[PDB]
Amino acid sequence: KEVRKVRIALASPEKIRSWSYGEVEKPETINYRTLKPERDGLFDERIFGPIKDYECACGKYKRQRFEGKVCERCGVEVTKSIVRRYRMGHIELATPAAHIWFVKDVPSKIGTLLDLSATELEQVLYFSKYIVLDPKGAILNGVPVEKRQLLTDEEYRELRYGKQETYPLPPGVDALVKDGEEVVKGQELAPGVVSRLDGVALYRFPRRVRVEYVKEPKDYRVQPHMNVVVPEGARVEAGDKIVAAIDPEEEVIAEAEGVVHLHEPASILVVKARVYPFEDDVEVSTGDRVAPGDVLADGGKVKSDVYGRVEVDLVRNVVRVVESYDIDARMGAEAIQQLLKELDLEALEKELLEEMKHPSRARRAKARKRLEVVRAFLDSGNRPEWMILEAVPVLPPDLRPMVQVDGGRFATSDLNDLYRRLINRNNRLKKLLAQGAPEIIIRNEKRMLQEAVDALLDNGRRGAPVTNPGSDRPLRSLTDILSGKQGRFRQNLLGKRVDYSGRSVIVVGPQLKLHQCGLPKRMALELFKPFLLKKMEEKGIAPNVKAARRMLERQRDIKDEVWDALEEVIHGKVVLLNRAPTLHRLGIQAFQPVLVEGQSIQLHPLVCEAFNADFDGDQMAVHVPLSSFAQAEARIQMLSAHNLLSPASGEPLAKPSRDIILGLYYITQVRKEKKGAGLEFATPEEALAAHERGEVALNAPIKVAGRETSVGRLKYVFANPDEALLAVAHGIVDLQDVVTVRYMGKRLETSPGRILFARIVAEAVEDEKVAWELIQLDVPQEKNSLKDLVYQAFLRLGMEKTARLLDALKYYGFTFSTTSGITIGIDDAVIPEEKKQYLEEADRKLLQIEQAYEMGFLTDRERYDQILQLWTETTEKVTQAVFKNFEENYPFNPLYVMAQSGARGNPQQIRQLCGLRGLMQKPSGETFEVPVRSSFREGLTVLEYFISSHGARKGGADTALRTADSGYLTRKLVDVTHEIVVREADCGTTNYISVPLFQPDEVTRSLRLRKRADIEAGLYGRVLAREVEVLGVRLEEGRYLSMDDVHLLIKAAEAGEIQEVPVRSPLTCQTRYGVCQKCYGYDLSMARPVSIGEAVGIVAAQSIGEPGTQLTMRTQGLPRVIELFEARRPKAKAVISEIDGVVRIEETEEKLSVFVESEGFSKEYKLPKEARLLVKDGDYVEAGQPLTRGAIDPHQLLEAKGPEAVERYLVEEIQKVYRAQGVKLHDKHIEIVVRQMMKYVEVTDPGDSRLLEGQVLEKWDVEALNERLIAEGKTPVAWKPLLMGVTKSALSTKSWLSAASFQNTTHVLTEAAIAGKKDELIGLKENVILGRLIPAGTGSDFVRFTQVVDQKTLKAIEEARK
């Protein structure tokens, strides 16, 4: 079957053991001598499979005949060695270990279910405090001990073993207390030592024993290696032992009868216990635990009266019960797993739901968070105790290989070292437990085992990272393998390295057609090698494919017919050319290769702008689509000649450029003379006669009788363009001379160059009548006029004729720029004579500013501002003087022509070359008082050059630090919008948006018509939601708006006939998981309605992010866009009115306050003194209308005005940044991203549903839920619109595969696993990860099942059946 969904869930110890083919019991990897895997180790063949196909370890089975067999000698299955990549083992832990993901991922899942703080969980898990599981009637400091109570180590010891203390008596002294006498706190035991607790006092080591013989206080000395064998106050018959020793020579016995008295204790032991004397055998033993009433000895004659630990003292023949309780308190994951197994999720949910009615919001907020985790376990079917590991899975050995390098050295992965540590510690703990080691040692081993598991799963998350000894590089754990820019997702699943790919330097191919590229022969030989081998065999070049491959291995073995065969292999095929960074989809284009000699790829000039490529050393990659589908898609969808318009704005993107523009501008610009320039005559005979006398120039404007003409128009009248260009060939007239020509039945007055341009377009499109309508004859052909020509040709003729026109424009532009005579010399940077006059004026005004400043008429700051204004004004005047000189005296100056035509440079750069450099800014942001008064032609001074370097470095640093921000933003946009596709023709919605044609300019306090570019960016290629009647023209509902329609609407607005246009937009589309054809509009790249199955989400992200690097960075620029897409609260946020009413300013010397007064309401706003109010007294302000200047908080705007208002604000404010930079971007692309930001709602009233108040879900889901509920007469859910940024919107998506591959992988995976989330594979990222066909383009269900059949077969099938 086909995979349709991917589910993630917790694995139980039972399931982990079902995966494993065996337990890894030893940390041995391979044998150091034979290099074979060690038995029971991390590379065992008996577990993970054979190392070579169909061959066991012992070498008894060596063929596939014994397939599925297991050798009895070695136990290795006889099968394929590839199973060694898929077969898992496991490690059986001596004690449970918590999974760090469900502990350290804030908020922890284990803590939330158990109601334990982050610190409390850590203290228990890492053996710092005990947690009570059974108090057993234990009292701690007069208070009963309760379950789930945390005990410190001292508290546990006091409760479990009691209170006791040893006081060392000074040598020689004798204690004031006897052995076995009860003491009270503060009592003095010895002359200088006082006890601190009440209990039985016991002599530890009596140094002197004083017996009393009866006939006599004989004494004996006690040494450390001796022990007394009798209790105090004992009658000893002559002969009985008294003090024992290692050597019987020093052993002490009693000569006669007496009473033994012990004196001089080494120390005093105070123990809180009850002493029970006995005579017969005791029924208990040391270490036993007893309760009140339990029999101790003498058949019930002596019984316990208190809880404690029973210890029998045979020397004193008494039973001591050290008062203590048998409390059950545990540390580590064994205790936590005990609590997690005892949880009743049914009971917990009921209690949480009851607490969901608490008046406090914090209590309900906490209850909702707990119940969301509880609900996840209840719904998914997972068990909370599965978050603690009893068996640890072991990765297949081939994914953590230990390989021998070409030099014989061994390389291994970090996972083997992490596995060995866990196995070594696990084995050691088992040995310690078998030895009955003390609790201190066991606790250290268990704490180390927990840490070893943590390092294996997520190294460095908790504590110091584990490093391999001899280095400080942290070991790479399982979490590091999956997360980050170098993880599995982004490095191996979302992108890959591919076969049939090449690379080389790119050079310009001017002779190529738009759809052609120059592919080196030696690159194409390797790229198409499998195809070439087949063709070589098909011909007689080689006998078979293997012989052909040997021929190609040696360069000197390649014959000349191999190149003929290669030419046949590539016939008709295309290749993909790729340049990094791929900012938009035009960074990959398909071309038909032309095999060329050399080693560099030839690139067509007209596609360089789309690739952002130049020829300073750039490189491109080459890719070969292999199947018929890949070749068809590349030739139809990705061919360069088919993508001529911009998907972002719909304007031409393959169009005339630097040299092409210059050559076409040069011929279409007319000459202007000054010799005559005014003389008036009576007849043309006189006017021409003066021309022969030299009094008037050919192109000097004159007036013959009443009309203004020139000599050329009167002297040279040509019957047709061919005659005019024949005269140009003979040198009679120039291309720039204005003469009279007869063309298309009209007696035009133009230059031969403009008539030549008209013929160029006419022949390219092969239509003289249509060509005449496409061009503007009476202007020089600059970048904008040539861009309009391409767009109009595309509309009227299509891709094929437009690509031909682009090829003809490129050819003639190149040809005419070579012979025109364009060059740059030092004298071409003409210095206006007005610069000297302006600088002298600035010196006088500056000297006058200093004079006033000396007189005190102004301060330092106003002196500083006035200086900057003076030099800012002078720079503008010098710029104007520079360009006024060019257009009057040097209209054909190379710098003027390049800037005027759009080929190169702008007025700012020309001023620095010809005028003055201007003012420079300090590193701190201030501007130097003294400007750079020299241009580049004159040459800066050393100090001026250094001062100018401050800004140059700052610009370079801004550019470097701006690429990372723009690239990061694009990735956020792609991940939030990647699932949006055009999925149907129409969603049936009746909603729409009104695009405003007028903008409320506040300075003039009135409405003013918006700019054409702004209106076009919001109207072009959009479906009219309602019928519109303007200027006698009826634009019916459902009509796509072309540029002509948009211009008609702008003309209607100019006449006061329409203020806004109702259109369909992605904001109001009702399609699920995408938009419909009617809500999107045109495919701006083709100027026609978008086709179903297009990934408009990806296009929108690339359109927005591509010009991201052109946004200034230095609340403005790219930072402004990033904040708007993240829905961040501005620091200097404006103040808006929550309700509508009249403003009443109460400004006072004490404070500033603004009052919005209504019929009954009076809202008060305390604004700061430095507040730039934009509303004065007596103004009727509506809800959400700003009162103070600044950026509006989108979340405050959403609450006050609504979803529509915030959506309009976000689109307009984002477009302002791009417009300020000259970038043209359709509103559709922003509205698609904004539609994703506003995709969620918050539950406020659950109604008759299981939703929790404050729960965040998708708007589509709640709407579907509400309609279902209403269908059955149940109260619907009341929700609240929600706004979130692109980052948060992408992470809260319903597909965990796409969210896990974005960022926050541990958090995404931990929540998905607990909930048992199932991924339906809806968007593009999920299908790319699994290598499936994406549900867009040719992979969309709308077009995927189309069938093609010819007439003959169709008739046979219909005939053969009917």
Partner DNA sequence: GCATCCGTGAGTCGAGGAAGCACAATTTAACACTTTTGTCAAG
Partner DNA sequence: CTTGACAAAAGTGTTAAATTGTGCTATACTGGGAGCCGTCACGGATGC
What is the contact surface with DNA in residues (CB under 7 A)? 32-34, 104, 106-107, 111, 117-119, 369, 405-407, 409, 461-462, 483-485, 490, 495, 497, 503, 580-581, 619, 960, 963-964, 966-968, 971, 1126, 1128-1129, 1285, 1288, 1303-1307
Give Cβ neighbours of residue 157 (< 8 Å, ≥ 6 apart): none
From 12-20, 289-297, 1070-1078, 1132-1140, span contacting Zn ion (CB under 5 A): 1070-1078
Task: Considering only residues 73 through 132, tell me which ones interact with Zn ion, judged by CB under 5 A.
Answer: 73-74
Binds Zn ion (CB under 5 A): choice among 4, 31, 52, 58? 58
| Least distance CB 898 / ligand 1N7 (angstroms) | 24
Task: Answer yes or no whether residue 814 interacts with ligand 1N7 by CB under 6 A.
Answer: no
Please say whether the beta carbons of 464 and 472 come within 8 A.
Answer: no
Place of tokens 């349709």: 4
Name the binder of 34 from DNA, ligand 1N7, Mg ion, none, CB < 5-8 A by kind: DNA
Please say whether the beta carbons of 79 and 49 come within 8 A.
Answer: yes
State the Cα angle at 439 between 438 and 443, rounded to 5°.
130
Task: Answer yes or no whether residue 62 interacts with Zn ion by CB under 5 A.
Answer: no
Residue type, 433: L
| Least distance CB 73 / Zn ion (angstroms) | 5
Task: Answer yes or no whether residue 69 interacts with Zn ion by CB under 5 A.
Answer: no
| Least distance CB 641 / ligand 1N7 (angstroms) | 13
CA distance 64 to 556: 43
Please say whether the beta carbons of 1048 and 1069 come within 8 A.
Answer: no
Task: Answer yes or no whether residue 56 interacts with Zn ion by CB under 5 A.
Answer: yes
In a 3-state reduction of DSSP, which class is residue 201? strand
Shorter beta-carbon distance to Zn ion: residue 57 or 132? 57
Shorter beta-carbon distance to DNA: residue 484 or 598? 484
| Least distance CB 782 / ligand 1N7 (angstroms) | 21
Task: Answer yes or no whether residue 980 interacts with Zn ion by CB under 5 A.
Answer: no
Shorter beta-carbon distance to Mg ion: residue 619 or 927? 619
Task: Answer yes or no whether residue 807 interacts with ligand 1N7 by CB under 6 A.
Answer: yes
Binds Mg ion (CB under 5 A): choice among 344, 439, 616, 1359? 616
Residue in 920, 915, 952, 905 with CA at minimum distance from that of residue 935: 915
H-only helix segments in 437-586: 439-457, 478-482, 488, 521-527, 529-538, 545-553, 561-569
Task: Answer yes or no whether residue 841 interacts with Mg ion by CB under 5 A.
Answer: no
Tokens of 401: 């290989």
H-only helix segments in 34-86: 45-48
| Least distance CB 7 / Mg ion (angstroms) | 48
Name the binder of 807 from DNA, Mg ion, ligand 1N7, none, CB < 5-8 A by kind: ligand 1N7
- Does 616 appear as a known binding residue? yes
Q: How many CB atoms neighbour CB 975 within 10 A?
A: 23
CA distance 105 to 414: 24
Please say whether the beta carbons of 80 and 54 come within 8 A.
Answer: yes
Q: How many CB atoms neighbour CB 238 within 10 A?
A: 11
Please say whether the beta carbons of 325 and 159 come within 8 A.
Answer: yes
Task: Considering only residues 1074 through 1103, tell me which ones interact with Zn ion, judged by CB under 5 A.
Answer: 1076, 1079
- Does 914 appear as a known binding residue? no
H/E element, 942: helix 942-977
Binds Zn ion (CB under 5 A): choice among 392, 1069, 1095, 1181? 1069
| Least distance CB 516 / DNA (angstroms) | 24
From 250-258, 350-358, 615-623, 819-827, span contacting Mg ion (CB under 5 A): 615-623
E strand intervals along 1094-1205:
1141-1145, 1152-1157, 1162-1167, 1180-1181
CA distance 953 to 923: 9
From 353-361, 807-815, 977-985, 1255-1263, span contacting ligand 1N7 (CB under 6 A): 807-815
Name the binder of 961 from Mg ion, Zn ion, ligand 1N7, none, CB < 5-8 A by kind: none
- Does 1076 appear as a known binding residue? yes
| Least distance CB 1128 / DNA (angstroms) | 5
Name the binder of 987 from ligand 1N7, DNA, Zn ion, none, CB < 5-8 A by kind: Zn ion
Tokens of 749: 């007055």
- DSSP letter string, 963-999: HHHHHHHHHHHHHHHTT-EEEES-------EEEESEE
Please say whether the beta carbons of 392 and 455 come within 8 A.
Answer: no
CA distance 1019 to 1076: 17
Shorter beta-carbon distance to DNA: residue 614 or 1057? 614
Task: Answer yes or no whether residue 816 interacts with ligand 1N7 by CB under 6 A.
Answer: no
Name the binder of 618 from Mg ion, ligand 1N7, DNA, none, CB < 5-8 A by kind: Mg ion
CA distance 379 to 7: 14
| Least distance CB 820 / ligand 1N7 (angstroms) | 17
Shorter beta-carbon distance to Mg ion: residue 410 or 615? 615
- DSSP letter string, 315-338: TTTEEEEE-----EEE-HHHHHHH
Task: Answer yes or no whether residue 763 interacts with ligand 1N7 by CB under 6 A.
Answer: yes
Please say whether the beta carbons of 458 and 133 come within 8 A.
Answer: no
H-only helix segments in 400-492: 414-434, 439-457, 478-482, 488
- DSSP letter string, 587-615: GEEEEEEEEESSSSEEE-GGGHHHHT--S
Q: How many CB atoms neighbour CB 674 within 10 A?
A: 12
Half-sphere exposure of 923 (CA within 13 A, CB side): 5
Helix axes 799-820, 783-797, angle to 10 degrees: 150
- Does 517 appear as a known binding residue? no
| Least distance CB 933 / Mg ion (angstroms) | 34
Task: Considering only residues 190 through 249, tell me which ones interact with ligand 1N7, judged by CB under 6 A.
Answer: none
Task: Answer yes or no whether residue 343 interacts with ligand 1N7 by CB under 6 A.
Answer: no
| Least distance CB 80 / DNA (angstroms) | 23
Name the binder of 811 from Zn ion, Mg ion, ligand 1N7, none, CB < 5-8 A by kind: ligand 1N7
Shorter beta-carbon distance to DNA: residue 763 or 1242? 1242
CA-CA distances (angstroms) from residue 1327 to 173, 280, 353, 1290? Answer: 87, 83, 39, 17
Shorter beta-carbon distance to Mg ion: residue 494 or 621? 621
Please say whether the beta carbons of 654 and 606 come within 8 A.
Answer: yes
CA distance 1356 to 482: 56
| Least distance CB 1018 / Zn ion (angstroms) | 17
- Does 305 appear as a known binding residue? no
Please say whether the beta carbons of 579 and 586 come within 8 A.
Answer: no
Task: Answer yes or no whether residue 808 interacts with ligand 1N7 by CB under 6 A.
Answer: yes
Shorter beta-carbon distance to DNA: residue 33 or 554? 33
Task: Answer yes or no whether residue 614 interacts with Mg ion by CB under 5 A.
Answer: yes
Shorter beta-carbon distance to ligand 1N7: residue 181 or 768? 768
Task: Answer yes or no whether residue 618 interacts with Mg ion by CB under 5 A.
Answer: yes
Tokens of 496: 């890959």
| Least distance CB 987 / Zn ion (angstroms) | 3
- In angstroms, the first-to-last Cα distance of the chain is 34
Q: How many CB atoms neighbour CB 561 within 10 A?
A: 12
- Does 1079 appear as a known binding residue? yes
Shorter beta-carbon distance to DNA: residue 234 or 494? 494
Binding site for ligand 1N7 (CB under 6 A): 763, 807-808, 811
Annotated binding site: 56, 58, 71, 74, 614, 616, 618, 987, 1069, 1076, 1079
Annotated binding site for Mg(2+): 614, 616, 618
Annotated binding site for Zn(2+): 56, 58, 71, 74, 987, 1069, 1076, 1079
Binding site for Zn ion (CB under 5 A): 56, 58, 60, 71, 73-74, 987, 1069, 1076, 1079
Binding site for Mg ion (CB under 5 A): 614, 616, 618
